[PDB]
Design a protein around this ligand. Structure first.
Ligand SMILES: *[C@@H]1O[C@H](CO)[C@@H](O)[C@H](O)[C@H]1NC(C)=O
Ligand SMILES: *[C@@H]1O[C@H](CO)[C@@H](O)[C@H](O)[C@H]1NC(C)=O
Lengths: 292, 55
């Protein structure tokens, strides 16, 4: 995010009507996959070439995948597998899609595989860490994980509450860690979704369970790392914590007015958090970036 | 035959600690020692879907 960049735009030939990015994902190579208005698209950052995706027929909300890049063919073929799904869709009647090669071709995935399931679909995930395919399945106010593969085949994890929806973040190194967060809640999983537990907050060296909705804080952004987790709460709050085995402990950082309605945080490196805000310049139409 | 459970700040048996140690692939060991004896017995790894404690 050095220098100034013009905002990313649709070329307008392949008019996609509204241009709302429901999700974005970094596939192997120079391609980036966007879900715009329920349709998949691929953008090559070295070019300006936009390619619509033909495999996905029904509208999809999210594209999910896992990326390894140890230098070999293995992490490449691991990166190729992808899922396309509509988050929140009815368990039966929604159509899930799978991609065997990058994101280039998408094939519909057959129902018989999950008849034994009824309810909303929080997400479908390929868990290469556990060599397992896990579906986040919401059958009531509580949500669970189901694993399709032999051992545990159709084995339910321990249920966790799930009012509203959640966004799922997978840790890069396939250690098995997961972050499920929305505006009013943040759940973490040391396991691969089997046990989903609240985060513990440290205040004056006493640790206690944290419920975001209970404390009335509204989280505006989250930054996720291989071993670490931070989030910025809309009322100028910043929490940093170390996600690990035996639970996750989060400390509230000293106060600073870091929220400006365009700010977002990310982890540049282990131990370095970065607060980024695009400032708009009227004359040049290219945005400056205010970094802290 | 013995039933054993890991004890933390919660004195009662907990199905989360068992799940954690089983999902890492860790199970307890019993070490029986004497003046002239040393023996080791391993608790068999089992899913924590039902078991509340090691046996
Ligand atoms: C799937 O798992 C169930 C129980 O988890 C078992 O009864 C069944 O035989 C398994 N079937 C296959 C095809 O793996
Ligand atoms: C195998 O796993 C099932 C699943 O909970 C369990 O009920 C059963 O007791 C296990 N069998 C043995 C021999 O450990």
């Amino acid at each position: 995010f050095e220098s100034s960049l013009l905002p990313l735009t649709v070329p307008k030939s392949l008019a996609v009507g509204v241009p709302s990015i429901t999700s974005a994902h970094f596939v192997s190579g120079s391609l980036v996959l966007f879900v715009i208005s329920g349709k998949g698209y691929s953008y090559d950052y070295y070019e300006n070439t936009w390619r619509k995706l033909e495999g996905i027929s029904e509208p999809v909300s999210h594209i999910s995948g896992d990326v390894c890049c140890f230098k070999g063919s293995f992490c490449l073929e691991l990166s190729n597998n992808l899922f396309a799904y509509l988050r929140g869709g009815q368990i039966p009647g929604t159509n899930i899609y799978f991609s065997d090669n990058g994101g280039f071709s998408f094939q519909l995935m057959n129902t018989d595989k999950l008849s034994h399931l009824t309810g909303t679909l929080g997400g479908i995930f390929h868990l290469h860490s556990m060599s397992q395919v896990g579906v986040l399945m919401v059958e009531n106010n509580l949500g669970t994980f189901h694993y399709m593969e032999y051992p545990l085949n159709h084995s339910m994890g321990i249920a966790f509450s799930y009012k509203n929806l959640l966004e799922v973040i997978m840790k890069p190194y396939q250690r098995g860690f997961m972050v499920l967060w929305n505006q009013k809640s943040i759940l973490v999983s040391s396991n691969s979704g089997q046990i989903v537990e609240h985060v513990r907050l440290i205040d004056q060296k006493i640790f206690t369970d944290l419920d975001v909705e209970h404390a009335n804080i509204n989280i505006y952004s989250v930054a996720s790392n291989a071993y670490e987790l931070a989030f910025l709460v809309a009322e100028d709050h910043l929490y940093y914590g170390s996600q690990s085995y035996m639970g996750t402990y989060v400390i509230k950082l000293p106060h600073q007015p870091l929220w400006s309605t365009h700010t977002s945080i990310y982890f540049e490196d282990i131990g370095i958090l970065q607060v980024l805000t695009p400032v708009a310049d009227p004359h040049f139409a290219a945005y400056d970036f205010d970094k802290c | 035959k013995v039933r054993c459970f890991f004890r933390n700040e919660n004195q009662s048996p907990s199905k989360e600690i068992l799940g954690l140690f089983t999902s890492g692939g860790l199970a307890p060991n019993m070490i029986i020692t004497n003046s002239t004896f040393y023996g080791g017995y391993y608790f068999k790894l089992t899913p924590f879907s039902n078991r509340l404690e090691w046996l």
